[PDB]
Design an enzyme around this catalytic site. Structure first.
Site, PDB file in Angstrom:
ATOM      1  N   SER A 118      -0.602  15.688 -11.946  1.00 31.84           N
ATOM      2  CA  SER A 118      -0.859  15.351 -13.337  1.00 31.84           C
ATOM      3  C   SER A 118      -1.101  16.616 -14.157  1.00 31.84           C
ATOM      4  O   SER A 118      -1.627  17.618 -13.668  1.00 31.84           O
ATOM      5  CB  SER A 118      -2.064  14.408 -13.423  1.00 31.84           C
ATOM      6  OG  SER A 118      -2.433  14.202 -14.771  1.00 31.84           O
ATOM      7  N   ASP A 174       0.832  -1.202   0.000  1.00 27.97           N
ATOM      8  CA  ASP A 174       0.000   0.000   0.000  1.00 27.97           C
ATOM      9  C   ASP A 174       0.870   1.257   0.000  1.00 27.97           C
ATOM     10  O   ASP A 174       1.344   1.685   1.057  1.00 27.97           O
ATOM     11  CB  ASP A 174      -0.901  -0.014   1.227  1.00 27.97           C
ATOM     12  CG  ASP A 174      -1.825   1.191   1.292  1.00 27.97           C
ATOM     13  OD1 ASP A 174      -1.910   1.939   0.294  1.00 27.97           O
ATOM     14  OD2 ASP A 174      -2.449   1.383   2.359  1.00 27.97           O
TER      15      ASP A 174
END
Length: 330
Positions: free
Chosen positions: A199, A35
């Protein structure tokens, strides 16, 4: 040193991935959910409340000659999905794919929430975010990657998650046969303890690319792709019959639909998520309403590049002095 381990989807939807991990002496092999959005290595154990164990493999520290109680240390964690677990702490030897760390904090669950109990395939979590998020008190502990870093050939790990197929986590090296083209690296902020990046925009299907900054986290422990409501609305508007359902808890779409792809920007580069990766199947067994793999982050407070996005790429978690993230197509 290096390590290399295969990671395998737990079910036919790729809801999560498990990777075998050797703990203790002699080895006890547990299948852990790696994770990158959390920083605790915790396991079902001989200390876990018996009614809360249902098929998981447990770590028994009393059978490990290298286990040592970390005196006074406790841990307690709550995840974005509302699940939680807590317990005490041992140090022990932990190996992943041939890479061995001695003295790793292994957090032994005394209690786990129902969703963990109900998932017999996940024996615990191995956190790979920054150690500043580790929950051990009163002395915070380091992740497996942080402990291994100095010994690694290169201070990196890579995630290569498969679509309906096995994939690979590598530690200490970049497998140049595992991706196509070049790797595009992008800046990371560690201020929230996550692999947090920006992004450069998105496209829906064959549509034109929209340049817009989207701050979010690279999170292998989250199934879906959570993005701003404006972006998610633009995606689902291209799917006839798709709608946001408050009763279901997100966007659903007709199972008879063919989904468009979704592209996200990494600097000047582009990662394309095929439409099929966004289909998470019937909302309930036999339903013709299917659950979408792209959902709004509006209620989370952070955008999350979960497995839906990461499995479309070869992803480098660069833990150099100034960390960065790399993405390549594959």
């Amino acid at each position: 040193s290096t390590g290399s381990a295969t990671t395998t989807p737990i079910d036919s939807l790729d809801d999560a991935y498990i990777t075998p991990v050797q703990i203790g002496t002699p080895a006890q092999t547990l299948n852990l959910d790696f994770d990158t959005g959390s920083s605790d290595l915790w396991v079902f154990s001989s200390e876990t409340t018996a009614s809360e164990v249902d098929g998981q493999t447990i770590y028994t520290p009393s059978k490990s000659t290298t286990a040592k109680l970390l005196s006074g240390a406790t841990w307690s964690i709550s995840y974005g999905d509302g699940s939680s677990s807590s317990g005490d702490v041992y140090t022990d030897t932990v190996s992943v794919g041939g890479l061995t760390v001695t003295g790793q904090a292994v957090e032994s669950a005394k209690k786990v929430s129902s969703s963990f109990t109900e998932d017999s395939t996940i024996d615990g979590l191995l956190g790979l975010a920054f150690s500043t998020l580790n929950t051990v008190s009163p002395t915070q502990q380091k992740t497996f990657f942080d402990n291994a870093k100095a010994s690694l050939d290169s201070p990196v790990f890579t995630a290569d998650l498969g679509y309906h197929a096995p994939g690979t986590y590598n530690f200490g090296f970049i497998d140049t046969t595992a991706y196509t083209g070049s790797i595009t690296y992008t800046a990371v902020s560690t201020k929230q303890g996550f692999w947090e990046w920006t992004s450069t925009g998105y496209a829906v299907g064959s549509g034109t690319f929209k340049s817009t900054s989207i701050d979010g986290i690279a999170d292998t422990g989250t199934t879906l792709l959570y993005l701003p409501a404006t972006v998610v609305s633009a995606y689902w508007a291209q799917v006839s019959g798709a709608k946001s359902s408050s009763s279901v808890g997100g966007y659903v779409f007709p199972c008879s639909a063919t989904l468009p792809s979704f592209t996200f920007g990494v600097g000047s580069a582009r990662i394309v998520i095929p439409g099929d990766y966004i289909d998470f199947g019937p909302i309930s067994t036999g339903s013709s309403s299917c659950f979408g793999g792209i959902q709004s982050s509006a209620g989370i407070g952070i955008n999350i590049f979960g497995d839906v996005a990461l499995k479309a790429a070869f992803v480098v978690f660069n833990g150099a002095t100034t960390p960065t993230l790399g993405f390549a197509s594959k």
